[PDB]
Amino acid sequence: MTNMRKTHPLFKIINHSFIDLPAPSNISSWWNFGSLLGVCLMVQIITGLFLAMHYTSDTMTAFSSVTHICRDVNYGWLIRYMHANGASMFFICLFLHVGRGLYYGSYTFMETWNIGVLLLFAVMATAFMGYVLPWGQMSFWGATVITNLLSAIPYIGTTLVEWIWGGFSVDKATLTRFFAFHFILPFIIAALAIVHLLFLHETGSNNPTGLNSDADKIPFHPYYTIKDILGILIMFLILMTLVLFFPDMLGDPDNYMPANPLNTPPHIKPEWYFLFAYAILRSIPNKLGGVLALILSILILALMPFLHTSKQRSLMFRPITQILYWILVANLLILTWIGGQPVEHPFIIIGQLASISYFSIILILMPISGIIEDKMLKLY
Amino acid sequence: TDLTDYLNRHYKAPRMVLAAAGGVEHQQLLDLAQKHLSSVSRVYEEDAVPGLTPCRFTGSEIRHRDDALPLAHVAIAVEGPGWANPDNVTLQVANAIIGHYDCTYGGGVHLSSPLASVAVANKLCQSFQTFNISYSDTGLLGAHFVCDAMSIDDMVFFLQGQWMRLCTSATESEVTRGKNILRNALVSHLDGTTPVCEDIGRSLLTYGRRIPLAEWESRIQEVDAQMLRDICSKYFYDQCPAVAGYGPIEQLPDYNRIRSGMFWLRF
Amino acid sequence: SHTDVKVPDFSDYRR
Amino acid sequence: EFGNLARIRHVISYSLSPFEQRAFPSYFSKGIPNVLRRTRERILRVAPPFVVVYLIYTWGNQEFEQSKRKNP
Amino acid sequence: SKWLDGFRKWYYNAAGFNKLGLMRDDTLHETEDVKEAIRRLPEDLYNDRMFRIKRALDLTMRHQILPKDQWTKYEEDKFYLEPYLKEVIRERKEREEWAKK
Ligand SMILES: CCCCCCCCCCCCCCCCCC(=O)OC[C@H](COP(=O)(O)OCCN)OC(=O)CCCCCCCCCCCCCCCCC
Ligand code: HEM
Ligand code: HEM
């Protein structure tokens, strides 16, 4: 007699990763958002399959295809709104996941954080190109403005403009390249997510206290299994509450018109999770400076593990850095609000002050705060 | 004073048995007991009757982690019926199905007990032993094993499977083997004067009478696989066990895995 | 001594 | 890897079955003071940045509605 | 001075690891130097440290803290890991200085 669960060639992988995996006992609900992110990605692909296998997206009548989806296809409105609000809920859960890692000292895992930064780049790209795809009015204007941003760099801007666009305005094949790697790139996201899981399984999980959790660890089943099921049901409640009661709350009406290049939009913005990033393009008065400002913001997010000058990992015992952290979180909220509002007085100077406060908090203020915290603790 | 009044209120003649086994004349010992033991002061001095409060079995788990010990001991026990219930006799046969094993056993691999065979075949335990302790209206029926740390979880699974086999897959062959083993146990134990006298004293204290060994044989012969498996379903299936551990017991599971493993999902 | 220990009162949690 | 994670000596853990204990043992009457304690211990570090940025938002919208007002 | 000592004690109380019964040296992030600082500890300090971490995790799991009589006050939070960690840091520094030349 042998144990089936520990000798099967396929089931030892699933129980070593799922059943008898030792996890910290004192894990709060925040880590559950990470699991939510995974299943959110899955339902996106499911809706994405339902956005291709019945549908005929065109380079010229994409908007007509989309309204025929919403009207003349059974449950097409439901899957379209689950795709849009699942992208919104994916960015909500991703922001909470990144904030969890940023707050509880989880950036001490090097390669896990680095491939997380790669995953963040990938989901930014997929969300922007999916927003480009249905060919609305302001979707067209946002695509035109940001391809004018990216056309400045020689041999990789211009050549890919002529590669992803047959012509600058419209010709016989325009949006199929956008559709092509908006189709394929979430599977690279799923592959990088299983690499994320593999590296975390190599290094183990982290408790909110930031200590060595090896004294008290429990099996993942059935505690965190039922905790994840409860979190998934709550997330699906909120997700189709946003889908099925308030479908155009996180959205906007300005992309519910057909694209017309002769007609300018009065107020132009991206989607909400891009909005603060758009504010940085309104901060520095340079297009290349704005592009490098976006890359520099996600690069200092990647560079945050090198700025940990404190000998305490988590921030449960770090009140000064906690205050700085919540100032930073409210600063990103102000940056989203500023990126929503158009370019006038004094939103320009609120954008300048918010961007320099964001960069000063992440770069210099937090390690000096950690040095002050360590000096006040009789450590050095 | 505590020893004095404890001895005063607890050493009383109606709660006392003078037992003898061996080359003894009964009339002579009765005369000598009437000569010597007829001064007890059996009257209640303070009129305080010590009654037997019915104890409650609570499913719980205590674990004493200490990793410098070389081997880990784990005992798992569910509530037993008691002395007066005959069903423990059937449960005795159940223990004779499961048996015991040590590292010094000369049987090797071909032992009839499947848990002992899988313990020697997979190198699981230093030893295991099945026990059935009975108290007034209660008791503990279960197993105790000493093993290294890195096997503990696996061995627990095997033990639970054997118990659930007694719920479902009891056949005539292992029931007959357990009956023969229990017959040899209850006749072979009562050899010499000391264990016979011990049996006499414990029988007149627990059952209130000395059960003859022919009556034990009649009770043993009455069992078959159907009633053994329904008593095992009555006392083991979907029950809350009591788990005690001492040693390197990090791989000893929680209460939830043991409680889930004490019922199969197929029925 | 192992006899010096006993379980705490779980009266606030028990039914 | 249960069994070779850490080395702990002389610790005793007591636990109960879930079937011999209450699922919500004094839920509200022992949960409200702990929630109030956590809120009192964390709101002084969480809330004031949110209050200041609410003030910033209200000032910005007040200036936007006060932008021209038919200037004399 | 005296006011700096008062704000230091107030910051120690507001840090919040005395509510969980933790000492000051228990909260250090386990880097490599801290790992061979723990590895050079005697058995009783190590056992008390492991019990303190396990009790802190148990209290954090239920979102509870110790009663105020059981909190770690300022005078008994001694520095037991400090000589081991400082000599580990010193020997790592001289190893780096040897490897530099
Ligand atoms: C006093 C009691 C009041 C309530 C009465 C009822 C009693 C409730 C129970 C109270 C129990 C005691 C307090 C327990 C909480 C823990 C201690 C605490 O939080 O203290 C207050 C804290 C002091 O600072 P601390 O980190 O402790 O360190 C001091 C070292 N100098 O100081 C703070 O946290 C203050 C932080 C203020 C931060 C303000 C930030 C404003 C600016 C944000 C801008 C963000 C956006 C920028 C935009 C730029 C462009 C415009
Ligand atoms: C590989 C699977 C996916 C496929 C095949 C796919 C395909 C599509 C298609 C055809 C559209 C246009 C239909 C519409 O606009 O409603 C679309 C829109 C969109 N997609 Fe995807 N998508 C996939 C995954 C994702 C993921 C993972 C995200 C999130 C990052 C995402 C974000 C979006 C967004 C934001 C829109 C715009 C919705 C709107 O019009 O408001 N997609 N996608
Ligand atoms: C692309 C979407 C993402 C998915 C699906 C994802 C998925 C997961 C999952 C399933 C876990 C394990 C559950 C847990 O314990 O939290 C996890 C943990 C983690 N993730 Fe992600 N993740 C994503 C993005 C990111 C990003 C962008 C970062 C970097 C900021 C990141 C950093 C981490 C860290 C540090 C942990 C370890 C938690 C800890 O032990 O402290 N993840 N992620």
mmCIF file of N, CA and C and ligand atoms in Angstrom, chain A residues 40-41 44-49 51-52 55 57 66 69 79-81 83-84 86-88 90-91 122-134 139 179 182-187 189 252 255-256 271 273, ligand 2:
data_model
loop_
_atom_site.group_PDB
_atom_site.id
_atom_site.type_symbol
_atom_site.label_atom_id
_atom_site.label_comp_id
_atom_site.label_asym_id
_atom_site.label_seq_id
_atom_site.Cartn_x
_atom_site.Cartn_y
_atom_site.Cartn_z
ATOM 1 N N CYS A 40 -9.126 36.571 -11.875
ATOM 2 C CA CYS A 40 -9.582 37.689 -12.689
ATOM 3 C C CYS A 40 -8.985 37.602 -14.080
ATOM 4 N N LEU A 41 -7.694 37.235 -14.150
ATOM 5 C CA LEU A 41 -7.034 37.053 -15.435
ATOM 6 C C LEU A 41 -7.729 35.968 -16.233
ATOM 7 N N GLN A 44 -11.007 37.058 -17.745
ATOM 8 C CA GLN A 44 -10.721 37.974 -18.841
ATOM 9 C C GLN A 44 -10.496 37.201 -20.126
ATOM 10 N N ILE A 45 -9.678 36.141 -20.041
ATOM 11 C CA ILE A 45 -9.384 35.322 -21.209
ATOM 12 C C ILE A 45 -10.647 34.626 -21.682
ATOM 13 N N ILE A 46 -11.504 34.224 -20.730
ATOM 14 C CA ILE A 46 -12.761 33.567 -21.075
ATOM 15 C C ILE A 46 -13.648 34.526 -21.846
ATOM 16 N N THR A 47 -13.767 35.765 -21.343
ATOM 17 C CA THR A 47 -14.546 36.766 -22.057
ATOM 18 C C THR A 47 -13.872 37.119 -23.365
ATOM 19 N N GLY A 48 -12.533 37.107 -23.368
ATOM 20 C CA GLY A 48 -11.798 37.346 -24.589
ATOM 21 C C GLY A 48 -12.050 36.280 -25.630
ATOM 22 N N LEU A 49 -12.191 35.021 -25.191
ATOM 23 C CA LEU A 49 -12.569 33.963 -26.119
ATOM 24 C C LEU A 49 -13.959 34.227 -26.670
ATOM 25 N N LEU A 51 -15.119 37.107 -26.993
ATOM 26 C CA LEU A 51 -15.006 38.265 -27.863
ATOM 27 C C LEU A 51 -14.308 37.950 -29.175
ATOM 28 N N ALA A 52 -14.011 36.687 -29.449
ATOM 29 C CA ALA A 52 -13.415 36.415 -30.751
ATOM 30 C C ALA A 52 -14.099 35.289 -31.513
ATOM 31 N N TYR A 55 -17.334 36.464 -33.206
ATOM 32 C CA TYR A 55 -17.378 37.866 -33.585
ATOM 33 C C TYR A 55 -16.419 38.130 -34.736
ATOM 34 N N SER A 57 -14.371 41.310 -35.836
ATOM 35 C CA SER A 57 -13.870 42.663 -35.648
ATOM 36 C C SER A 57 -13.186 43.145 -36.922
ATOM 37 N N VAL A 66 -19.196 46.030 -32.649
ATOM 38 C CA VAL A 66 -19.384 46.082 -31.199
ATOM 39 C C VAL A 66 -20.851 46.327 -30.839
ATOM 40 N N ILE A 69 -22.677 43.226 -31.429
ATOM 41 C CA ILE A 69 -22.437 42.344 -30.290
ATOM 42 C C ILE A 69 -23.406 42.671 -29.161
ATOM 43 N N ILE A 79 -21.091 39.690 -21.655
ATOM 44 C CA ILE A 79 -19.681 39.324 -21.741
ATOM 45 C C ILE A 79 -18.811 40.538 -22.059
ATOM 46 N N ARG A 80 -19.325 41.500 -22.839
ATOM 47 C CA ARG A 80 -18.565 42.721 -23.103
ATOM 48 C C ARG A 80 -18.373 43.549 -21.835
ATOM 49 N N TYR A 81 -19.434 43.700 -21.040
ATOM 50 C CA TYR A 81 -19.311 44.466 -19.810
ATOM 51 C C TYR A 81 -18.524 43.715 -18.744
ATOM 52 N N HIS A 83 -15.948 41.886 -19.576
ATOM 53 C CA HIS A 83 -14.575 42.116 -20.019
ATOM 54 C C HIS A 83 -14.069 43.489 -19.578
ATOM 55 N N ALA A 84 -14.885 44.531 -19.773
ATOM 56 C CA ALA A 84 -14.471 45.887 -19.401
ATOM 57 C C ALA A 84 -14.340 46.050 -17.886
ATOM 58 N N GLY A 86 -14.061 43.667 -15.738
ATOM 59 C CA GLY A 86 -13.034 42.775 -15.253
ATOM 60 C C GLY A 86 -11.650 43.334 -15.449
ATOM 61 N N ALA A 87 -11.441 44.117 -16.513
ATOM 62 C CA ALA A 87 -10.199 44.878 -16.624
ATOM 63 C C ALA A 87 -10.079 45.903 -15.501
ATOM 64 N N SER A 88 -11.187 46.582 -15.182
ATOM 65 C CA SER A 88 -11.178 47.548 -14.080
ATOM 66 C C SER A 88 -10.921 46.875 -12.731
ATOM 67 N N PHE A 90 -9.449 43.986 -12.331
ATOM 68 C CA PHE A 90 -8.082 43.492 -12.409
ATOM 69 C C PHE A 90 -7.091 44.568 -12.009
ATOM 70 N N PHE A 91 -7.317 45.807 -12.450
ATOM 71 C CA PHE A 91 -6.402 46.870 -12.047
ATOM 72 C C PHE A 91 -6.603 47.278 -10.592
ATOM 73 N N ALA A 122 3.273 44.382 -18.834
ATOM 74 C CA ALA A 122 2.430 43.625 -19.752
ATOM 75 C C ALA A 122 0.950 43.965 -19.584
ATOM 76 N N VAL A 123 0.482 44.141 -18.345
ATOM 77 C CA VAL A 123 -0.942 44.434 -18.181
ATOM 78 C C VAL A 123 -1.262 45.881 -18.562
ATOM 79 N N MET A 124 -0.308 46.814 -18.388
ATOM 80 C CA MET A 124 -0.466 48.163 -18.939
ATOM 81 C C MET A 124 -0.626 48.126 -20.454
ATOM 82 N N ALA A 125 0.224 47.341 -21.130
ATOM 83 C CA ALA A 125 0.169 47.243 -22.588
ATOM 84 C C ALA A 125 -1.139 46.616 -23.067
ATOM 85 N N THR A 126 -1.567 45.521 -22.420
ATOM 86 C CA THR A 126 -2.799 44.848 -22.833
ATOM 87 C C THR A 126 -4.024 45.716 -22.596
ATOM 88 N N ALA A 127 -4.078 46.416 -21.455
ATOM 89 C CA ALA A 127 -5.228 47.266 -21.168
ATOM 90 C C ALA A 127 -5.317 48.436 -22.137
ATOM 91 N N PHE A 128 -4.176 49.067 -22.452
ATOM 92 C CA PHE A 128 -4.197 50.178 -23.399
ATOM 93 C C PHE A 128 -4.601 49.715 -24.794
ATOM 94 N N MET A 129 -4.077 48.577 -25.246
ATOM 95 C CA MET A 129 -4.384 48.148 -26.604
ATOM 96 C C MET A 129 -5.799 47.597 -26.719
ATOM 97 N N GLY A 130 -6.311 46.985 -25.648
ATOM 98 C CA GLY A 130 -7.710 46.608 -25.622
ATOM 99 C C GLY A 130 -8.633 47.808 -25.642
ATOM 100 N N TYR A 131 -8.226 48.903 -24.986
ATOM 101 C CA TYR A 131 -8.997 50.139 -25.090
ATOM 102 C C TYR A 131 -8.913 50.742 -26.487
ATOM 103 N N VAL A 132 -7.789 50.538 -27.176
ATOM 104 C CA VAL A 132 -7.651 51.008 -28.554
ATOM 105 C C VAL A 132 -8.596 50.246 -29.483
ATOM 106 N N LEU A 133 -8.765 48.939 -29.243
ATOM 107 C CA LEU A 133 -9.468 48.029 -30.158
ATOM 108 C C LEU A 133 -10.890 48.399 -30.606
ATOM 109 N N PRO A 134 -11.839 48.828 -29.754
ATOM 110 C CA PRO A 134 -13.212 49.006 -30.261
ATOM 111 C C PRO A 134 -13.417 50.225 -31.149
ATOM 112 N N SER A 139 -11.049 56.990 -28.169
ATOM 113 C CA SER A 139 -10.095 55.890 -28.293
ATOM 114 C C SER A 139 -9.141 56.129 -29.457
ATOM 115 N N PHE A 179 -5.128 43.889 -32.470
ATOM 116 C CA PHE A 179 -5.907 42.724 -32.065
ATOM 117 C C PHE A 179 -5.028 41.490 -31.913
ATOM 118 N N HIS A 182 -2.783 42.026 -28.660
ATOM 119 C CA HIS A 182 -3.705 42.004 -27.525
ATOM 120 C C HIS A 182 -4.293 40.611 -27.324
ATOM 121 N N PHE A 183 -4.409 39.823 -28.396
ATOM 122 C CA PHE A 183 -4.810 38.429 -28.258
ATOM 123 C C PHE A 183 -3.718 37.605 -27.590
ATOM 124 N N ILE A 184 -2.480 37.709 -28.066
ATOM 125 C CA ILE A 184 -1.510 36.723 -27.593
ATOM 126 C C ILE A 184 -0.863 37.107 -26.258
ATOM 127 N N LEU A 185 -0.735 38.409 -25.932
ATOM 128 C CA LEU A 185 0.067 38.815 -24.772
ATOM 129 C C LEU A 185 -0.475 38.455 -23.373
ATOM 130 N N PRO A 186 -1.795 38.339 -23.128
ATOM 131 C CA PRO A 186 -2.240 37.751 -21.846
ATOM 132 C C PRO A 186 -1.796 36.315 -21.590
ATOM 133 N N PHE A 187 -1.461 35.539 -22.613
ATOM 134 C CA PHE A 187 -0.918 34.216 -22.336
ATOM 135 C C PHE A 187 0.535 34.290 -21.876
ATOM 136 N N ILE A 189 1.309 36.824 -20.064
ATOM 137 C CA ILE A 189 0.995 37.231 -18.691
ATOM 138 C C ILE A 189 0.756 36.011 -17.802
ATOM 139 N N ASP A 252 -16.977 55.615 -19.373
ATOM 140 C CA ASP A 252 -17.162 56.995 -19.793
ATOM 141 C C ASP A 252 -17.977 57.032 -21.077
ATOM 142 N N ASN A 255 -16.466 57.442 -25.503
ATOM 143 C CA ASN A 255 -16.094 56.431 -26.481
ATOM 144 C C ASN A 255 -17.297 55.677 -27.035
ATOM 145 N N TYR A 256 -18.517 56.128 -26.742
ATOM 146 C CA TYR A 256 -19.709 55.543 -27.340
ATOM 147 C C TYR A 256 -20.167 56.283 -28.590
ATOM 148 N N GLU A 271 -8.525 55.802 -19.695
ATOM 149 C CA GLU A 271 -9.283 55.177 -18.620
ATOM 150 C C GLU A 271 -8.662 55.521 -17.266
ATOM 151 N N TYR A 273 -7.465 53.972 -14.560
ATOM 152 C CA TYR A 273 -6.218 53.403 -14.069
ATOM 153 C C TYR A 273 -4.999 53.886 -14.843
HETATM 154 C C1 HEM F 2 -6.326 37.071 -24.551
HETATM 155 C C2 HEM F 2 -7.549 37.374 -24.143
HETATM 156 C C3 HEM F 2 -8.201 38.612 -24.588
HETATM 157 C C4 HEM F 2 -8.830 38.834 -25.769
HETATM 158 C C5 HEM F 2 -8.997 37.849 -26.891
HETATM 159 C C6 HEM F 2 -9.306 40.166 -25.748
HETATM 160 C C7 HEM F 2 -10.005 40.687 -26.840
HETATM 161 C C8 HEM F 2 -10.635 41.906 -26.763
HETATM 162 C C9 HEM F 2 -11.509 42.437 -27.725
HETATM 163 C C10 HEM F 2 -11.915 41.773 -29.011
HETATM 164 C C11 HEM F 2 -11.915 43.650 -27.281
HETATM 165 C C12 HEM F 2 -12.858 44.576 -27.996
HETATM 166 C C13 HEM F 2 -14.293 44.292 -27.549
HETATM 167 C C14 HEM F 2 -14.718 45.338 -26.554
HETATM 168 O O1 HEM F 2 -14.182 46.419 -26.549
HETATM 169 O O2 HEM F 2 -15.687 45.070 -25.668
HETATM 170 C C15 HEM F 2 -11.298 43.887 -26.038
HETATM 171 C C16 HEM F 2 -11.496 45.039 -25.306
HETATM 172 C C17 HEM F 2 -10.795 45.310 -24.141
HETATM 173 N N1 HEM F 2 -9.940 44.509 -23.496
HETATM 174 FE FE1 HEM F 2 -9.423 42.651 -24.066
HETATM 175 N N2 HEM F 2 -8.975 40.758 -24.588
HETATM 176 C C18 HEM F 2 -8.301 39.875 -23.833
HETATM 177 C C19 HEM F 2 -7.761 40.023 -22.561
HETATM 178 C C20 HEM F 2 -7.772 41.244 -21.914
HETATM 179 C C21 HEM F 2 -7.158 41.511 -20.684
HETATM 180 C C22 HEM F 2 -6.381 40.531 -19.844
HETATM 181 C C23 HEM F 2 -7.401 42.836 -20.389
HETATM 182 C C24 HEM F 2 -6.953 43.565 -19.191
HETATM 183 C C25 HEM F 2 -5.714 44.040 -19.119
HETATM 184 C C26 HEM F 2 -8.170 43.375 -21.452
HETATM 185 C C27 HEM F 2 -8.588 44.683 -21.474
HETATM 186 C C28 HEM F 2 -9.496 45.149 -22.417
HETATM 187 C C29 HEM F 2 -10.110 46.476 -22.343
HETATM 188 C C30 HEM F 2 -9.880 47.521 -21.285
HETATM 189 C C31 HEM F 2 -10.921 46.575 -23.409
HETATM 190 C C32 HEM F 2 -11.776 47.758 -23.768
HETATM 191 C C33 HEM F 2 -13.193 47.527 -23.252
HETATM 192 C C34 HEM F 2 -14.033 48.726 -23.593
HETATM 193 O O3 HEM F 2 -14.473 48.897 -24.848
HETATM 194 O O4 HEM F 2 -14.309 49.531 -22.738
HETATM 195 N N3 HEM F 2 -8.381 42.376 -22.377
HETATM 196 N N4 HEM F 2 -10.509 42.798 -25.739
#
